[PDB]
């Protein structure tokens, strides 16, 4: 019954997810894995369905990790969906500062793909700016991809001076 739940959560079918989650005894099916190790929380957050991820958090799910260290917030920032992002941030605050296998945060992906409102949403909250495995901040990762709107809305922000402070004096690519 894991594959019907994965298909129903991956496409926002809310009534099928309510019918499958009627028996609330066993939660091993709720946080089960995939071939790529993604929970139904990850599938609902990847495509940006806010009511499904709200229902799964109300029934009780765990912020597990992908095989590549991703989280639900990493997928919601990779996609640029502000609603699911806002729901995940309104539930818990201990999920924001989180590293993948490469040291990126959600703000790194949200600045890399050029989603301005996602960067402003993670930046209105405390984002905990940190470097990469290659010592690249999110601002440099936005500048190397020529994303005009996100660096403009970082300039309009109030954290800009702090965003100016951090870089590496030794790397040739990051200056």
């Amino acid at each position: 019954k894991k594959s019907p739940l994965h298909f129903a959560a991956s496409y926002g079918r809310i009534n099928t997810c309510q019918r499958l989650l009627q028996d609330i005894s066993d939660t091993r099916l709720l946080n089960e894995g995939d071939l790529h190790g993604m929970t139904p929380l990850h599938l609902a957050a990847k495509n940006g369905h806010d009511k499904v991820v709200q229902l799964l958090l109300k029934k009780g799910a765990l912020f597990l990790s992908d095989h590549n260290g991703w989280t639900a917030l990493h997928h919601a920032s990779m996609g640029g969906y502000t609603q699911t992002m806002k729901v995940i941030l309104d539930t818990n605050l201990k999920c924001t500062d989180r590293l993948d296998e490469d040291g990126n945060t959600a703000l790194h992906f949200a600045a890399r793909e050029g989603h301005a409102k996602a960067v402003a949403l993670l930046l209105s909250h405390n984002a905990d700016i940190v470097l990469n495995k290659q010592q690249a901040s999110f601002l440099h990762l936005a500048l190397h991809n020529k994303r005009k709107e996100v660096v403009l809305t970082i300039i309009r922000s109030k954290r800009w001076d702090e965003c100016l402070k951090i870089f590496s004096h030794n790397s040739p690519g990051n200056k």
Binding site: S3, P4, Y11, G12, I14, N47
Partner: peptide, 16 residues
């Protein structure tokens, strides 16, 4: 609109 179609579509005899 296409994502809305998949969200509201009825699936019988193609499940699992």
């Amino acid at each position: 609109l296409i994502k809305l179609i998949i969200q509201k579509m009825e699936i019988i005899s193609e499940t699992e």
